[PDB]
Swiss-Prot record, chain A:
This is Small ribosomal subunit protein eS21A. It comes from Saccharomyces cerevisiae (strain ATCC 204508 / S288c). The keyword Acetylation applies. The keyword Ribonucleoprotein applies. GO terms for biological process: endonucleolytic cleavage in ITS1 to separate SSU-rRNA from 5.8S rRNA and LSU-rRNA from tricistronic rRNA transcript (SSU-rRNA, 5.8S rRNA, LSU-rRNA); endonucleolytic cleavage to generate mature 3'-end of SSU-rRNA from (SSU-rRNA, 5.8S rRNA, LSU-rRNA); translation. Component of the ribosome, a large ribonucleoprotein complex responsible for the synthesis of proteins in the cell. The small ribosomal subunit (SSU) binds messenger RNAs (mRNAs) and translates the encoded message by selecting cognate aminoacyl-transfer RNA (tRNA) molecules. The large subunit (LSU) contains the ribosomal catalytic site termed the peptidyl transferase center (PTC), which catalyzes the formation of peptide bonds, thereby polymerizing the amino acids delivered by tRNAs into a polypeptide chain.
UniProtKB/Swiss-Prot annotation, chain B:
Keywords: Cytoplasm, Ribonucleoprotein, Ribosomal protein. The chain holds residues 2 to 98 of 119 of the full protein. Its main location: cytoplasm. This is Small ribosomal subunit protein eS26B. Component of the ribosome, a large ribonucleoprotein complex responsible for the synthesis of proteins in the cell. The small ribosomal subunit (SSU) binds messenger RNAs (mRNAs) and translates the encoded message by selecting cognate aminoacyl-transfer RNA (tRNA) molecules. The large subunit (LSU) contains the ribosomal catalytic site termed the peptidyl transferase center (PTC), which catalyzes the formation of peptide bonds, thereby polymerizing the amino acids delivered by tRNAs into a polypeptide chain. GO terms for cellular component: 90S preribosome; cytosol; cytosolic small ribosomal subunit. The lineage of its organism: Eukaryota, Fungi, Dikarya, Ascomycota, Saccharomycotina. It comes from the Eukaryota. Component of the small ribosomal subunit (SSU). Mature yeast ribosomes consist of a small (40S) and a large (60S) subunit. The 40S small subunit contains 1 molecule of ribosomal RNA (18S rRNA) and 33 different proteins (encoded by 57 genes). The large 60S subunit contains 3 rRNA molecules (25S, 5.8S and 5S rRNA) and 46 different proteins (encoded by 81 genes). eS26 interacts with eS1 forming part of the mRNA exit tunnel. eS26 interacts with TSR2. Belongs to the eukaryotic ribosomal protein eS26 family.
From Swiss-Prot, chain E:
Component of the ribosome, a large ribonucleoprotein complex responsible for the synthesis of proteins in the cell. The small ribosomal subunit (SSU) binds messenger RNAs (mRNAs) and translates the encoded message by selecting cognate aminoacyl-transfer RNA (tRNA) molecules. The large subunit (LSU) contains the ribosomal catalytic site termed the peptidyl transferase center (PTC), which catalyzes the formation of peptide bonds, thereby polymerizing the amino acids delivered by tRNAs into a polypeptide chain. Belongs to the eukaryotic ribosomal protein eS17 family. The keyword Acyltransferase does not apply. One of its GO terms (molecular function) is structural constituent of ribosome. Present with 30900 molecules/cell in log phase SD medium. PROSITE patterns: RIBOSOMAL_S17E (PS00712). Pfam families: Ribosomal_S17e. The gene is RPS17A. Component of the small ribosomal subunit (SSU). Mature yeast ribosomes consist of a small (40S) and a large (60S) subunit. The 40S small subunit contains 1 molecule of ribosomal RNA (18S rRNA) and 33 different proteins (encoded by 57 genes). The large 60S subunit contains 3 rRNA molecules (25S, 5.8S and 5S rRNA) and 46 different proteins (encoded by 81 genes). This is Small ribosomal subunit protein eS17A. Keywords: Cytoplasm, Ribonucleoprotein, Ribosomal protein. GO terms for cellular component: cytosol; cytosolic small ribosomal subunit.
UniProtKB/Swiss-Prot annotation, chain F:
GO terms for molecular function: RNA binding; structural constituent of ribosome; zinc ion binding. Keywords: Cytoplasm, Metal-binding, Methylation, Ribonucleoprotein, Ribosomal protein, Zinc, Zinc-finger. Its cofactor is Zn(2+). It is found in: Cytoplasm. The modification S-methylcysteine is found at residue 39. HAMAP family: Ribosomal_eS27. A zinc finger (C4-type) spans 36-58. It comes from Saccharomyces cerevisiae (strain ATCC 204508 / S288c). It holds the Pfam family Ribosomal_S27e. The keyword Ribonucleoprotein applies. This is Small ribosomal subunit protein eS27A. Binds 1 zinc ion per subunit.
Length: 87, 97, 129, 206, 121, 81, 216, 25, 96
RNA sequence: AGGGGAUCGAAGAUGAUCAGAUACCGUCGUAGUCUUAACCAUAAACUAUGCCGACUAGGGAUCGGGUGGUGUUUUUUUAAUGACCCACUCGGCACCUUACGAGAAAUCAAAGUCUUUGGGUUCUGGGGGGAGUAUGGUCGCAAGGCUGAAACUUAAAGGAAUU
RNA sequence: GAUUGACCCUU
């Protein structure tokens, strides 16, 4: 958020969980950042380019992190036939 | 404070259970709360088995055993060490040894 | 028995939101529920929702996002005047810059800021933020 | 986006079926595991080998992405996975912890066994619940070889496989090591298979 | 009163780990080398250290000893654990699978040898 | 779970659920046209009869009521409807 | 002089990380107070109170002192430390270490009209420890810090200028009151708002980008 | 004193008071 | 439903319940019963004059043993007897 | 009140240990314990947890039903009316490991969805005692039950066992 | 499962 004259204030806009879109605390030490490398028609990992996900400690401790990562991977295309929307 | 979630007995959905008399002191205790044990023992104390076998008329005798159920009130069971005071965490062990 | 259908809907939405689920099922889909969900939709608090038509009363499947903090209902539906709108907003909203006290007025169901822009008042329903 | 050459090859499916990876837990089945497929009579469930391979390649992609190859840490405490993770650490960087995982290794910076990883590969969450619980303190992503009845709490990515078969655990670790090397590019033979035998990660009692 | 103090036990273990081949199973030679191979402030303490050292050599001479690992032991265990027999355990030994395994592979879309076995109950 | 399609659930799970716990509740009962051997006497009977249903022709009761489904007579041909 | 033992500590010593907002953004676990005192040299530490705690033994009572201290710089960042030690000075120092370790950022907001710099908190917030529940309410400019002295000092060290407070329970338990108020000001950056609704790209972690400058 | 015995003693006092008042009236 | 009625027409129930539960307060009950004007020694007044009467064999509380005097006083408006404490050192000169 | 009255047994008789023992322990033993009409209306009458409705990690099990699986026995191993075994809905008595959460904690899938405070509704409490007393009603044959205070006194009394 | 009843002073 900013004041009237532009001038973005409250620096450190925080991250949001990529599964439940809730703010990740400063001391939410059960939250993680998964990095998944991409391959480009060569079978090898291009350094410096990964698809990143922020998974919240809430879902990690709930046990839904595997399902959430499957859904995110299949939605972003780097997974094929693991996650099914219709249960 | 509530020591046990079972209230020291086994009664959920009853309200009342007919009582039983203790085998040692004849104290009235609810049947579900008792420390009932089953005593199944040889009649010949397992020591005079040789003597009974040699003095028996009938060979290959079955040598029956006696069966009874001893209902202990909590006080008498603790005193006679049928059960004993356990640590708080392992009071929840429903499993006999 | 089932007294406040809107309260049951809002409570189900809140529980699903807190659990993290991206969708919630609601029974039995009142018109007041539809209007409340339309207000949340307009202000971006839920997303989409579907009206399943069983012939009895209808169900609603609401796609949630991470944005809803707390949707609630004020029971009874207190009579609220122009003077009382500020009272209620300062009572049950996190701040004065976001969140809406929703009320059924003579011009249909709306939030408090649109009620002020239309200069109308009515009976308080609930709140979202 | 996969280039459609990573998928389950018949030779890999043969390896997995020989290792009996597809055999899961009994009728006990945690709801957080949709990897099951057509629960077979007698009560033994069938693990879907296609998605076990897909999760294997996803985990390998994560281990390839994470840049320093030694911060990756492979946890095992079961009697079967210890040699599997030792050979995994002999193949790639992947500093291992076999046998006892001392408490306060991810925390407790003054410990001798103190590591500060960026990814932990756990052989079995139920056996290594200590390592996962500690990783939850220091933001360590968790890959775990997860059977259909394993405790999927605090696990980031789970590989659906058999935790009871030594062949299963050994072959899963073999696939993980082979593929992490494949994506890293050390094993140039993209089409040719690996020379190291799938039975190399096999525990011997005597 | 035969239990050794932690200092004696740990000193004996440290001696064994880094001088396993240099010393033998005889107490007399063990002490006559220990007096110069480790600096001790007591003749009796040297005697205790060498006696426990001899006991651990007797323990290793029949079976491995836990907590102690030296260069020769580590070499032999790495050789044993990198050993592998040429005949594989995953080759054709005749594959017993069920109808569910069979149509699993069919639904995945692959072909490989297998045997047809009825579902047990 | 966290994300799932309640709007379009799988038919397996929907059939597994209780008849009133589905998206749109529908009867799990059905009807059947029953024909006794010999005379065709085509009559339609409800599965959960609660009635010793018979035609007015003769003593040819076709079902015996039970707790749920009606157990049809030994010699009877049913056709799902 | 320092010789840190942590990847984050070594990077901070090497100067790779310039501000504590990166640590707060990536939620790294901080285990060294040197990290905090290098990232924020404007931080002021003063003890909130000392109380004696006794433990009975077969020979008398063993008395230690519990020190409750609050560390914080004039705007944005504050932590709260509690330590029980045999001597008062040792308890004070260790409490300073813990309060520096537990430093968190504060979401300062406007009561309205967003004219100047942020003065109050963005949202009504609440913390709980024990029975003490402390509730922070945004206040208009010029209101001041309407609070009891213990929580008022914590808010002053946090950096808010004008805020109402309301406490429920045994507020006389100073440690629980301060912990509840600390939780209340910690939840401010966790409350989600429409200005925070926008989706952000998830940058690489500082440790991930700067792993290449390790020992080997 | 055990509360049951205190209650019994209070009952005895109450009935003695009742008897005395009945005699007076 | 948190106990209390919440209906829009439950105002009578809420008022009556509050009226009934006010009586549990010590000061409200005294105020509404007029215990100051019926049984308080001062008749609900801040101060009261009296005539000091005699000496009584009373003993102080913990910790002491002091039996010299504590003024028994007969009030003028009520005629009731109350024991008052002479509030300073040297009480002897004023209790003639 | 009338029946009944074996046993056990407030009272009591009585032997013992005891400083004392009109207590514990021993043997008797009226009332009672059992019924029939009429009263009584209390209990740690307890889950110390009001009722109705909704929603929130997961399970080994169990009782009443019990969508289904060309899965076993006497009869005919080659139609059939058993019962068990496994998916598994529904309604019950309950249980099993952090906390999503709650709580002062013990602990609690409710004691959760309560300072992010409103689903409906009934009852009750407002520091300890005096006191469940006095008094007035009211019911009761009585014992007593229900309603039910003040004067006065008091700085604690209490709730979880942390060493 | 006997008889072991009692013990005036402060945080």
């Amino acid at each position: 958020m900013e004041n009237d004259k532009g001038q973005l204030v409250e620096l450190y806009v925080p991250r949001k969980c990529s599964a439940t879109n809730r703010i990740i605390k400063a001391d939410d030490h059960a939250s993680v950042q998964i990095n998944v490398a991409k391959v480009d028609e060569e079978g090898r990992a291009i350094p410096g380019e990964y698809v990143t996900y922020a998974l919240s400690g809430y879902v990690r401790s709930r046990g839904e992190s595997d399902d959430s990562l499957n859904r995110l991977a299949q939605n972003d295309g780097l997974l094929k036939n693991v996650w099914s929307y219709s249960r | 404070p509530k020591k046990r979630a079972s209230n020291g007995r086994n009664k959920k959905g009853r309200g009342h259970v007919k009582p039983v008399r203790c085998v040692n002191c004849s104290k009235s205790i609810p049947k579900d709360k008792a420390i009932k044990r089953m005593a199944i023992r040889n009649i010949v104390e397992a020591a005079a088995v040789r003597d009974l076998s040699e003095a028996s008329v009938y060979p290959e005798y079955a040598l029956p055993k006696t069966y009874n159920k001893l209902h202990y009130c909590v006080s008498c069971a603790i005193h006679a060490r049928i059960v004993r005071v356990r640590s708080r965490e392992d009071r929840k062990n429903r499993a006999p040894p | 028995t089932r007294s406040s259908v809107l309260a049951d809907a809002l409570n189900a939405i809140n529980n699903a939101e807190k659990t993290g689920k991206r969708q919630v099922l609601i029974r039995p889909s009142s018109k007041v529920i539809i209007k409340f969900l339309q207000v949340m939709q307009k202000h971006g608090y839920i997303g989409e929702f579907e009206y399943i038509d069983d012939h009895r009363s209808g169900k609603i499947v609401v796609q949630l996002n991470g944005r809803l903090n707390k949707c609630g209902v004020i029971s009874p539906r207190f009579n609220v005047k122009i003077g009382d709108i500020e009272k209620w907003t300062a009572n049950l909203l996190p701040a004065r810059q976001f969140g809406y006290v929703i009320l059924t007025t003579s011009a249909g169901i709306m939030d408090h800021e649109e009620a002020r822009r239309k200069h109308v008042s009515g009976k308080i329903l609930g709140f979202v933020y | 986006s996969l280039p459609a050459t990573f998928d389950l090859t018949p030779e890999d499916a043969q390896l997995l079926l020989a290792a009996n990876t597809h055999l899961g837990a009994r009728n006990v089945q945690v709801h957080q595991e949709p990897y099951v497929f057509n629960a077979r009579p007698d009560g033994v469930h069938v693990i879907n080998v296609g998605k076990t391979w897909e999760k294997l390649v996803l985990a390998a992609r994560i281990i390839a992405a994470i840049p320093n190859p030694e911060d990756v840490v492979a946890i095992s405490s079961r009697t079967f996975g210890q040699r599997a993770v030792l050979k995994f650490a002999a193949h790639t960087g992947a500093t291992p912890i076999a046998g006892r995982f001392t408490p306060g290794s991810f925390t407790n910076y003054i410990t001798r066994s103190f590591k500060e990883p960026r990814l932990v590969i756990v052989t079995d969450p139920r056996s290594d619940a200590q390592a996962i619980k500690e990783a939850s303190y220091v933001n360590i992503p968790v890959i775990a070889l997860t059977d259909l009845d394993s405790p999927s709490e605090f696990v980031d990515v789970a590989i659906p496989c058999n935790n009871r078969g030594k062949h299963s655990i050994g072959l899963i670790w073999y696939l993980l090591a082979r593929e992490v090397l494949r994506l890293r590019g050390a094993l140039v033979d993209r089409t040719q298979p690996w020379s190291i035998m799938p039975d190399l990660y096999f525990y011997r009692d005597p | 009163g035969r239990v050794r103090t932690k200092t004696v036990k740990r000193a004996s273990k440290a001696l064994i780990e880094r001088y396993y081949p240099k010393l033998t199973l005889d107490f007399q030679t063990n002490k006559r080398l220990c007096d110069e191979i480790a600096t001790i402030q007591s003749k009796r303490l040297r005697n205790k250290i060498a006696g426990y050292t001899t006991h651990l050599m007797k323990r290793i001479q029949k079976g491995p000893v836990r907590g102690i690992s030296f260069k020769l032991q580590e070499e032999e265990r790495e050789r044993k654990d990198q050993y592998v027999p040429e005949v594989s355990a995953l080759d054709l030994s005749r594959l017993n699978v069920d109808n569910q395994t069979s149509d699993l592979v069919k639904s995945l879309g692959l072909k490989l040898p297998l045997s047809v076995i009825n579902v047990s109950a | 779970v966290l994300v799932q399609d309640l709007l379009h659930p799988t038919a397996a799970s929907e059939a597994r659920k209780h008849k009133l716990k589905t998206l749109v509740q529908g009867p799990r009962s059905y009807f059947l046209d029953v024909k006794c051997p010999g005379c065709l006497n085509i009559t339609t009977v409800f599965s959960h009869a609660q009635t010793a249903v018979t035609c007015e022709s003769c003593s040819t009761i076709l079902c015996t009521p039970t707790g749920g489904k009606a157990k049809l007579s030994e010699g009877t041909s049913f056709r799902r409807k | 002089g320092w010789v840190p033992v942590t990847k984050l500590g070594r990077l901070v010593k090497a100067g790779k990380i310039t501000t504590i907002e990166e640590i707060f953004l990536h939620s790294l676990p901080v285990k060294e107070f040197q990290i905090i005192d290098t990232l924020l040299p404007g931080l002021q530490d003063e003890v909130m109170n000392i109380k004696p705690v006794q433990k009975q033994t077969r020979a008398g009572q063993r008395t230690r002192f519990k020190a409750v201290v609050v560390v914080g710089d004039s705007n944005g960042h504050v932590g709260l430390g509690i330590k029980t030690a045999k001597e008062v000075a040792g308890a004070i120092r260790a409490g300073i270490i813990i309060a520096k370790l537990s430093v968190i950022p504060i979401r300062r907001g406007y009561w309205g009209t967003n004219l100047g710099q942020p003065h109050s908190l963005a949202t009504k917030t609440t913390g709980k420890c024990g029975s003490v529940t402390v509730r922070l309410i945004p206040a208009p400019r010029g209101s001041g810090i309407v609070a009891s002295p213990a929580v008022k000092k914590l808010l002053q060290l946090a950096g808010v200028e004008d805020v109402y407070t309301q406490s429920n329970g045994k507020t006389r338990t100073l440690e629980n009151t301060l912990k509840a108020a600390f939780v209340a000001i910690g939840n401010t950056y966790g409350f989600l708002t429409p200005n925070l609704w926008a989706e952000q790209p998830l940058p690489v972690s500082p440790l991930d980008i700067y792993s290449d400058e390790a020992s080997a | 004193m055990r509360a049951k015995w205190r209650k019994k003693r209070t009952r005895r006092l109450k009935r003695k008071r009742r008897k005395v008042r009945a005699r007076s009236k | 439903g948190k106990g209390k009625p919440r209906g829009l027409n439950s105002a009578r129930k809420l008022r009556v319940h509050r009226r009934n539960n006010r009586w549990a307060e010590n000061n409200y009950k005294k105020r509404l019963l007029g215990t100051a004007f019926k049984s308080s020694p001062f008749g609900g007044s801040s101060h009261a004059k009296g005539i000091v009467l005699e000496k009584l064999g009373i003993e102080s509380k913990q910790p002491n043993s002091a039996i010299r005097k504590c003024v028994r006083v007969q009030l003028i408006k009520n005629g009731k007897k109350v024991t008052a404490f002479v509030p300073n050192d040297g009480c002897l000169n004023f209790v003639d």
